[PDB]
Scaffold this motif. Structure first.
Motif, short mmCIF file in Angstrom:
data_model
loop_
_atom_site.label_atom_id
_atom_site.label_comp_id
_atom_site.label_asym_id
_atom_site.label_seq_id
_atom_site.Cartn_x
_atom_site.Cartn_y
_atom_site.Cartn_z
N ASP A 195 0.83 -1.19 0.00
CA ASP A 195 0.00 0.00 0.00
C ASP A 195 0.87 1.25 0.00
OD1 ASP A 195 -2.63 1.46 0.48
OD2 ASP A 195 -1.60 1.94 2.37
N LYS A 196 1.92 1.24 0.81
CA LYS A 196 2.93 2.28 0.74
C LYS A 196 3.52 2.37 -0.67
CE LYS A 196 7.74 2.74 2.43
NZ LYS A 196 8.69 2.59 3.58
N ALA A 197 3.71 1.24 -1.34
CA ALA A 197 4.22 1.33 -2.71
C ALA A 197 3.19 1.92 -3.65
CB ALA A 197 4.67 -0.04 -3.22
N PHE A 198 1.90 1.62 -3.44
CA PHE A 198 0.91 2.19 -4.35
C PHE A 198 0.76 3.69 -4.14
CE2 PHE A 198 -3.41 3.55 -5.39
CZ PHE A 198 -3.38 3.32 -6.77
N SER A 199 0.81 4.15 -2.88
CA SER A 199 0.79 5.57 -2.58
C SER A 199 1.80 6.32 -3.43
CB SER A 199 1.10 5.81 -1.10
OG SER A 199 0.24 5.09 -0.24
N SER A 200 3.05 5.89 -3.38
CA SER A 200 4.12 6.59 -4.08
C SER A 200 3.91 6.52 -5.58
CB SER A 200 5.47 6.00 -3.70
OG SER A 200 5.55 5.83 -2.29
N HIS A 201 3.55 5.35 -6.09
CA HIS A 201 3.26 5.22 -7.51
C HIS A 201 2.21 6.23 -7.94
CE1 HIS A 201 2.58 3.28 -11.39
NE2 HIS A 201 1.29 3.34 -11.12
N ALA A 202 1.15 6.38 -7.13
CA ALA A 202 0.03 7.24 -7.47
C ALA A 202 0.41 8.71 -7.40
CB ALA A 202 -1.15 6.95 -6.54
N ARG A 203 1.03 9.11 -6.30
CA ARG A 203 1.40 10.51 -6.10
C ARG A 203 2.38 10.99 -7.16
NH1 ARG A 203 -0.33 10.86 -0.11
NH2 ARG A 203 0.91 9.05 0.59
N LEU A 204 3.06 10.09 -7.85
CA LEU A 204 4.09 10.46 -8.80
C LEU A 204 3.67 10.29 -10.24
CD1 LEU A 204 7.52 9.44 -7.44
CD2 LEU A 204 6.28 11.54 -7.22
N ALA A 207 1.08 11.17 -13.63
CA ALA A 207 0.37 12.33 -14.15
C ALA A 207 -1.13 12.21 -13.91
CB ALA A 207 0.67 12.48 -15.64
N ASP A 208 -1.64 10.99 -13.86
CA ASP A 208 -3.07 10.75 -13.68
C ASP A 208 -3.47 11.02 -12.23
OD1 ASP A 208 -5.66 9.95 -13.76
OD2 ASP A 208 -5.23 7.86 -14.36
N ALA A 209 -4.33 12.01 -12.02
CA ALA A 209 -4.77 12.32 -10.66
C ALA A 209 -5.83 11.35 -10.15
CB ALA A 209 -5.30 13.75 -10.60
N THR A 210 -6.46 10.58 -11.04
CA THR A 210 -7.48 9.62 -10.61
C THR A 210 -6.91 8.51 -9.75
OG1 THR A 210 -7.32 7.95 -12.34
CG2 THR A 210 -8.51 10.00 -12.88
N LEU A 211 -5.63 8.16 -9.94
CA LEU A 211 -4.99 7.13 -9.14
C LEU A 211 -5.03 7.43 -7.65
CD1 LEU A 211 -4.06 6.06 -11.88
CD2 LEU A 211 -1.80 5.76 -10.88
N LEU A 212 -5.29 8.69 -7.28
CA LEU A 212 -5.43 9.06 -5.88
C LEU A 212 -6.79 8.69 -5.33
CD1 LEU A 212 -3.99 12.56 -6.63
CD2 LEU A 212 -2.69 10.73 -5.52
N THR A 213 -7.75 8.39 -6.20
CA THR A 213 -9.05 7.87 -5.80
C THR A 213 -9.18 6.38 -6.07
OG1 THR A 213 -10.22 8.13 -7.89
CG2 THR A 213 -9.94 10.13 -6.50
N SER A 214 -8.12 5.74 -6.55
CA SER A 214 -8.18 4.34 -6.91
C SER A 214 -7.90 3.48 -5.69
CB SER A 214 -7.18 4.02 -8.02
OG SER A 214 -7.36 2.69 -8.48
N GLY A 215 -8.68 2.42 -5.54
CA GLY A 215 -8.50 1.50 -4.43
C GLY A 215 -8.76 0.07 -4.85
N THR A 216 -8.69 -0.82 -3.87
CA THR A 216 -8.97 -2.22 -4.15
C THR A 216 -9.06 -2.99 -2.85
OG1 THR A 216 -8.42 -4.08 -5.59
CG2 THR A 216 -6.62 -3.14 -4.29
N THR A 217 -9.94 -3.99 -2.83
CA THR A 217 -9.83 -5.01 -1.80
C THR A 217 -8.65 -5.91 -2.10
OG1 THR A 217 -11.15 -6.67 -2.93
CG2 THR A 217 -12.31 -5.13 -1.47
N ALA A 218 -8.25 -6.67 -1.10
CA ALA A 218 -7.22 -7.67 -1.29
C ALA A 218 -7.54 -8.84 -0.38
CB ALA A 218 -5.84 -7.09 -0.97
#
Ligand SMILES: [Mg+2]
Ligand SMILES: [Mg+2]
Ligand SMILES: [Mg+2]
Ligand SMILES: [Mg+2]
Length: 257
Positions: free
Chosen positions: A79-88, A90-101
């Motif tokens: 999840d920490k890895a997805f945070s960084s991927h998203a914040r970096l 260009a697509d701002a939607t990745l900040l609203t993207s989630g998932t169950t696991a």
């Protein structure tokens, strides 16, 4: 254990995209891996877990013998890895993207450990009776509600949604809700498989769960030929009962060891 026998179906329902992901693999000689990811707000987070979960686990296998502890670290690390991927990106939607696991590790053919966040499910069918391996993370859970408030979030209604957005209380991603109490830390369960009876592991997303309870899932596993047919049987039954979300089932047969 054979992986040619693993059965899986994923149907899209009445939605524009199918955001469910699933994977299974032999990780090492001793460790099998099975997972479903129900994505939302874009597939980015489900795809990320599908792409990277196996390496988080394998890099931790040499370091951690308690598999409940291992998957906890793996979930928080991914999840920490997805945070960084998203914040970096260009697509701002990745900040609203989630998932169950919902992830299962089977060690030495005998030790089954299951970790999940969200409302996708894992059950075990032995001799046609189900055992729940997961409990849904939804705001109608007193303990989950309390964390949501303690962290400064709220619950709104049509049916209960965290901050009016998220129908669950734990997840991977959803970067903005993380401060409001949506966490990535799983609940875990450890069991030993039966030496003599055949037992099946079934992972399902909420599209199926909405309409097919755990017992009816055993019936399909018990009464269908192979797991392939059983998986397709149960996703199609959910659609016919009236489910509209994406529906994914994965059926894993375990031999009596
Ligand atoms: Mg893979
Ligand atoms: Mg979904
Ligand atoms: Mg849901
Ligand atoms: Mg869903």
């Amino acid at each position: 254990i054979s992986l040619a026998k693993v059965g899986c179906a994923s149907q899209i329902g009445k939605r524009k995209e199918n955001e469910d992901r699933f994977d299974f693999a032999q990780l090492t000689d001793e460790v099998l891996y099975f997972a479903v990811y129900d994505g939302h707000g874009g597939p980015a987070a489900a795809d990320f877990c599908h792409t990277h979960m196996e390496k988080c686990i394998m890099d931790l296998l040499p370091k951690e013998a308690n598999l409940e502890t291992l998957l906890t670290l793996a979930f928080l690390e991914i999840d920490k890895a997805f945070s960084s991927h998203a914040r970096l990106s260009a697509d701002a939607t990745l900040l609203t993207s989630g998932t169950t696991a919902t992830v299962a590790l089977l060690r030495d053919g005998i030790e089954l450990v299951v970790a999940s966040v969200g409302d996708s499910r894992a059950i075990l069918c032995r001799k046609g009776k189900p055992m729940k391996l997961t409990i849904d993370h939804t705001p109608e859970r007193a303990d989950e509600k309390e964390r949501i408030k303690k962290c400064g979030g709220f619950v709104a209604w049509n049916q209960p949604h965290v901050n009016g957005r998220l129908a669950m209380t734990r997840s991977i991603g959803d970067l903005d809700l993380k401060t409001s109490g949506v966490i990535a830390e799983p609940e875990t369960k450890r069991i030993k498989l039966h030496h003599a009876d055949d037992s099946f592991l079934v992972l399902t997303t909420d599209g199926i769960n909405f309409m097919v309870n755990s017992q009816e899932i055993c019936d399909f596993v018990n009464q269908c030929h192979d797991p392939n047919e059983a998986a397709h049987a149960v996703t199609e039954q959910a659609i016919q009962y009236g489910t509209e979300d994406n529906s994914t089932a994965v059926v894993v047969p375990f031999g009596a060891w």
